mmCIF file of N, CA and C in Angstrom:
data_model
loop_
_atom_site.group_PDB
_atom_site.id
_atom_site.type_symbol
_atom_site.label_atom_id
_atom_site.label_comp_id
_atom_site.label_asym_id
_atom_site.label_seq_id
_atom_site.Cartn_x
_atom_site.Cartn_y
_atom_site.Cartn_z
ATOM 1 N N UNK A 5 -117.438 138.960 36.205
ATOM 2 C CA UNK A 5 -117.152 137.794 37.123
ATOM 3 C C UNK A 5 -118.412 136.929 37.368
ATOM 4 N N UNK A 6 -118.344 135.636 37.016
ATOM 5 C CA UNK A 6 -119.388 134.600 37.291
ATOM 6 C C UNK A 6 -119.430 134.268 38.794
ATOM 7 N N UNK A 7 -120.437 133.516 39.236
ATOM 8 C CA UNK A 7 -120.588 133.074 40.654
ATOM 9 C C UNK A 7 -120.444 131.560 40.759
ATOM 10 N N UNK A 8 -119.414 131.128 41.471
ATOM 11 C CA UNK A 8 -119.109 129.700 41.717
ATOM 12 C C UNK A 8 -119.694 129.323 43.072
ATOM 13 N N UNK A 9 -120.242 128.100 43.179
ATOM 14 C CA UNK A 9 -120.797 127.592 44.439
ATOM 15 C C UNK A 9 -120.336 126.171 44.609
ATOM 16 N N UNK A 10 -120.226 125.788 45.866
ATOM 17 C CA UNK A 10 -119.928 124.417 46.289
ATOM 18 C C UNK A 10 -121.103 123.896 47.123
ATOM 19 N N UNK A 11 -121.354 122.591 47.016
ATOM 20 C CA UNK A 11 -122.519 121.979 47.708
ATOM 21 C C UNK A 11 -122.099 121.518 49.085
ATOM 22 N N UNK A 12 -122.794 122.022 50.101
ATOM 23 C CA UNK A 12 -122.547 121.633 51.511
ATOM 24 C C UNK A 12 -123.495 120.476 51.855
ATOM 25 N N UNK A 13 -123.015 119.221 51.866
ATOM 26 C CA UNK A 13 -123.855 118.036 52.184
ATOM 27 C C UNK A 13 -124.306 118.078 53.665
ATOM 28 N N UNK A 14 -123.743 118.904 54.539
ATOM 29 C CA UNK A 14 -124.229 118.993 55.943
ATOM 30 C C UNK A 14 -125.586 119.722 55.939
ATOM 31 N N UNK A 15 -125.688 120.919 55.352
ATOM 32 C CA UNK A 15 -126.962 121.679 55.283
ATOM 33 C C UNK A 15 -127.845 121.197 54.140
ATOM 34 N N UNK A 16 -127.276 120.633 53.082
ATOM 35 C CA UNK A 16 -128.005 120.247 51.863
ATOM 36 C C UNK A 16 -128.277 121.430 50.949
ATOM 37 N N UNK A 17 -127.399 122.416 50.937
ATOM 38 C CA UNK A 17 -127.548 123.610 50.090
ATOM 39 C C UNK A 17 -126.231 123.999 49.421
ATOM 40 N N UNK A 18 -126.347 124.677 48.291
ATOM 41 C CA UNK A 18 -125.212 125.343 47.614
ATOM 42 C C UNK A 18 -124.735 126.538 48.443
ATOM 43 N N UNK A 19 -123.433 126.800 48.468
ATOM 44 C CA UNK A 19 -122.832 127.937 49.220
ATOM 45 C C UNK A 19 -121.864 128.673 48.293
ATOM 46 N N UNK A 20 -121.870 129.962 48.390
ATOM 47 C CA UNK A 20 -120.976 130.855 47.617
ATOM 48 C C UNK A 20 -119.552 130.686 48.127
ATOM 49 N N UNK A 21 -118.595 130.620 47.215
ATOM 50 C CA UNK A 21 -117.170 130.805 47.610
ATOM 51 C C UNK A 21 -117.018 132.238 48.104
ATOM 52 N N UNK A 22 -116.032 132.517 48.930
ATOM 53 C CA UNK A 22 -115.626 133.915 49.250
ATOM 54 C C UNK A 22 -115.350 134.677 47.950
ATOM 55 N N UNK A 23 -115.449 136.010 47.973
ATOM 56 C CA UNK A 23 -115.202 136.856 46.784
ATOM 57 C C UNK A 23 -113.798 136.542 46.228
ATOM 58 N N UNK A 24 -112.860 136.327 47.133
ATOM 59 C CA UNK A 24 -111.444 136.024 46.875
ATOM 60 C C UNK A 24 -111.292 134.651 46.202
ATOM 61 N N UNK A 25 -111.845 133.597 46.782
ATOM 62 C CA UNK A 25 -111.742 132.256 46.148
ATOM 63 C C UNK A 25 -112.550 132.227 44.852
ATOM 64 N N UNK A 26 -113.720 132.858 44.797
ATOM 65 C CA UNK A 26 -114.508 132.947 43.562
ATOM 66 C C UNK A 26 -113.634 133.582 42.455
ATOM 67 N N UNK A 27 -112.884 134.638 42.783
ATOM 68 C CA UNK A 27 -112.029 135.379 41.822
ATOM 69 C C UNK A 27 -110.951 134.416 41.311
ATOM 70 N N UNK A 28 -110.285 133.686 42.188
ATOM 71 C CA UNK A 28 -109.257 132.687 41.812
ATOM 72 C C UNK A 28 -109.880 131.678 40.834
ATOM 73 N N UNK A 29 -111.038 131.122 41.186
ATOM 74 C CA UNK A 29 -111.633 129.997 40.416
ATOM 75 C C UNK A 29 -112.047 130.560 39.065
ATOM 76 N N UNK A 30 -112.742 131.688 39.070
ATOM 77 C CA UNK A 30 -113.393 132.206 37.828
ATOM 78 C C UNK A 30 -112.305 132.692 36.853
ATOM 79 N N UNK A 31 -111.201 133.239 37.367
ATOM 80 C CA UNK A 31 -110.107 133.713 36.475
ATOM 81 C C UNK A 31 -109.509 132.487 35.758
ATOM 82 N N UNK A 32 -109.290 131.382 36.453
ATOM 83 C CA UNK A 32 -108.760 130.156 35.834
ATOM 84 C C UNK A 32 -109.741 129.671 34.756
ATOM 85 N N UNK A 33 -111.027 129.617 35.078
ATOM 86 C CA UNK A 33 -112.074 129.201 34.119
ATOM 87 C C UNK A 33 -112.026 130.064 32.858
ATOM 88 N N UNK A 34 -112.103 131.366 33.010
ATOM 89 C CA UNK A 34 -112.132 132.312 31.860
ATOM 90 C C UNK A 34 -110.836 132.226 31.041
ATOM 91 N N UNK A 35 -109.715 131.877 31.665
ATOM 92 C CA UNK A 35 -108.389 131.825 30.988
ATOM 93 C C UNK A 35 -108.230 130.488 30.263
ATOM 94 N N UNK A 36 -109.225 129.580 30.300
ATOM 95 C CA UNK A 36 -109.178 128.313 29.545
ATOM 96 C C UNK A 36 -108.527 127.176 30.290
ATOM 97 N N UNK A 37 -108.083 127.333 31.528
ATOM 98 C CA UNK A 37 -107.483 126.201 32.270
ATOM 99 C C UNK A 37 -108.548 125.109 32.483
ATOM 100 N N UNK A 38 -108.146 123.859 32.735
ATOM 101 C CA UNK A 38 -109.101 122.755 33.000
ATOM 102 C C UNK A 38 -109.233 122.505 34.511
ATOM 103 N N UNK A 39 -108.412 123.104 35.360
ATOM 104 C CA UNK A 39 -108.523 122.952 36.822
ATOM 105 C C UNK A 39 -107.841 124.156 37.472
ATOM 106 N N UNK A 40 -108.062 124.341 38.753
ATOM 107 C CA UNK A 40 -107.457 125.494 39.475
ATOM 108 C C UNK A 40 -107.262 125.079 40.931
ATOM 109 N N UNK A 41 -106.155 125.495 41.530
ATOM 110 C CA UNK A 41 -105.805 125.218 42.941
ATOM 111 C C UNK A 41 -106.096 126.463 43.764
ATOM 112 N N UNK A 42 -106.571 126.282 44.976
ATOM 113 C CA UNK A 42 -106.799 127.406 45.908
ATOM 114 C C UNK A 42 -106.606 126.814 47.293
ATOM 115 N N UNK A 43 -106.424 127.682 48.274
ATOM 116 C CA UNK A 43 -106.258 127.307 49.698
ATOM 117 C C UNK A 43 -107.361 128.021 50.492
ATOM 118 N N UNK A 44 -107.857 127.383 51.526
ATOM 119 C CA UNK A 44 -108.863 127.953 52.441
ATOM 120 C C UNK A 44 -108.523 127.355 53.788
ATOM 121 N N UNK A 45 -108.240 128.212 54.768
ATOM 122 C CA UNK A 45 -107.798 127.788 56.106
ATOM 123 C C UNK A 45 -106.557 126.928 56.020
ATOM 124 N N UNK A 46 -105.567 127.312 55.211
ATOM 125 C CA UNK A 46 -104.299 126.544 55.137
ATOM 126 C C UNK A 46 -104.477 125.146 54.495
ATOM 127 N N UNK A 47 -105.672 124.773 53.991
ATOM 128 C CA UNK A 47 -105.902 123.475 53.273
ATOM 129 C C UNK A 47 -105.954 123.742 51.753
ATOM 130 N N UNK A 48 -105.520 122.754 50.964
ATOM 131 C CA UNK A 48 -105.325 122.888 49.499
ATOM 132 C C UNK A 48 -106.469 122.126 48.779
ATOM 133 N N UNK A 49 -107.054 122.773 47.777
ATOM 134 C CA UNK A 49 -108.192 122.222 46.999
ATOM 135 C C UNK A 49 -107.899 122.461 45.526
ATOM 136 N N UNK A 50 -108.288 121.490 44.698
ATOM 137 C CA UNK A 50 -108.354 121.662 43.238
ATOM 138 C C UNK A 50 -109.823 121.571 42.785
ATOM 139 N N UNK A 51 -110.294 122.590 42.081
ATOM 140 C CA UNK A 51 -111.537 122.535 41.299
ATOM 141 C C UNK A 51 -111.180 121.964 39.934
ATOM 142 N N UNK A 52 -111.792 120.843 39.612
ATOM 143 C CA UNK A 52 -111.728 120.185 38.286
ATOM 144 C C UNK A 52 -112.909 120.683 37.440
ATOM 145 N N UNK A 53 -112.664 121.473 36.405
ATOM 146 C CA UNK A 53 -113.743 122.013 35.555
ATOM 147 C C UNK A 53 -114.369 120.927 34.681
ATOM 148 N N UNK A 54 -113.646 119.861 34.378
ATOM 149 C CA UNK A 54 -114.099 118.834 33.417
ATOM 150 C C UNK A 54 -115.135 117.967 34.129
ATOM 151 N N UNK A 55 -114.986 117.715 35.426
ATOM 152 C CA UNK A 55 -115.924 116.921 36.270
ATOM 153 C C UNK A 55 -116.802 117.830 37.157
ATOM 154 N N UNK A 56 -116.518 119.135 37.245
ATOM 155 C CA UNK A 56 -117.244 120.105 38.097
ATOM 156 C C UNK A 56 -117.297 119.606 39.549
ATOM 157 N N UNK A 57 -116.117 119.296 40.083
ATOM 158 C CA UNK A 57 -115.935 118.804 41.470
ATOM 159 C C UNK A 57 -114.737 119.533 42.078
ATOM 160 N N UNK A 58 -114.844 119.884 43.341
ATOM 161 C CA UNK A 58 -113.737 120.354 44.189
ATOM 162 C C UNK A 58 -113.137 119.142 44.884
ATOM 163 N N UNK A 59 -111.831 118.980 44.742
ATOM 164 C CA UNK A 59 -111.136 117.823 45.361
ATOM 165 C C UNK A 59 -110.199 118.359 46.451
ATOM 166 N N UNK A 60 -110.343 117.841 47.673
ATOM 167 C CA UNK A 60 -109.423 118.106 48.816
ATOM 168 C C UNK A 60 -108.072 117.427 48.503
ATOM 169 N N UNK A 61 -106.974 118.186 48.411
ATOM 170 C CA UNK A 61 -105.643 117.670 47.978
ATOM 171 C C UNK A 61 -105.013 116.762 49.038
ATOM 172 N N UNK A 62 -105.465 116.810 50.287
ATOM 173 C CA UNK A 62 -104.966 115.937 51.395
ATOM 174 C C UNK A 62 -105.766 114.623 51.447
ATOM 175 N N UNK A 63 -107.092 114.689 51.422
ATOM 176 C CA UNK A 63 -107.956 113.520 51.713
ATOM 177 C C UNK A 63 -108.580 112.939 50.426
ATOM 178 N N UNK A 64 -108.526 113.621 49.274
ATOM 179 C CA UNK A 64 -109.272 113.239 48.052
ATOM 180 C C UNK A 64 -110.786 113.432 48.145
ATOM 181 N N UNK A 65 -111.337 113.924 49.253
ATOM 182 C CA UNK A 65 -112.793 114.210 49.374
ATOM 183 C C UNK A 65 -113.285 115.125 48.228
ATOM 184 N N UNK A 66 -114.453 114.790 47.693
ATOM 185 C CA UNK A 66 -115.081 115.399 46.508
ATOM 186 C C UNK A 66 -116.352 116.133 46.916
ATOM 187 N N UNK A 67 -116.444 117.396 46.551
ATOM 188 C CA UNK A 67 -117.689 118.159 46.693
ATOM 189 C C UNK A 67 -118.046 118.732 45.346
ATOM 190 N N UNK A 68 -119.349 118.682 45.025
ATOM 191 C CA UNK A 68 -119.865 119.226 43.777
ATOM 192 C C UNK A 68 -119.661 120.754 43.742
ATOM 193 N N UNK A 69 -119.417 121.290 42.551
ATOM 194 C CA UNK A 69 -119.408 122.749 42.274
ATOM 195 C C UNK A 69 -120.359 123.008 41.124
ATOM 196 N N UNK A 70 -120.799 124.239 41.073
ATOM 197 C CA UNK A 70 -121.624 124.735 39.974
ATOM 198 C C UNK A 70 -121.187 126.161 39.654
ATOM 199 N N UNK A 71 -121.557 126.594 38.461
ATOM 200 C CA UNK A 71 -121.292 127.942 37.909
ATOM 201 C C UNK A 71 -122.652 128.576 37.588
ATOM 202 N N UNK A 72 -122.916 129.795 38.035
ATOM 203 C CA UNK A 72 -123.924 130.703 37.403
ATOM 204 C C UNK A 72 -123.226 131.807 36.586
ATOM 205 N N UNK A 73 -123.368 131.803 35.257
ATOM 206 C CA UNK A 73 -122.833 132.870 34.354
ATOM 207 C C UNK A 73 -123.440 134.236 34.708
#
């Protein structure tokens, strides 16, 4: 299992997804999908692997993601 992070523009640092959301994201990546949907606090997000951005499905807000193999 790789480590996925999202950039928190409030602190100005990368943050680890929960073990659970990391597992969802990384399984989609390894299975060859180009994007993956997950929920956190009842809100819906898509990680776009082609742009390496997390998109909020309600507001369209974009946060950067990164992968460490």
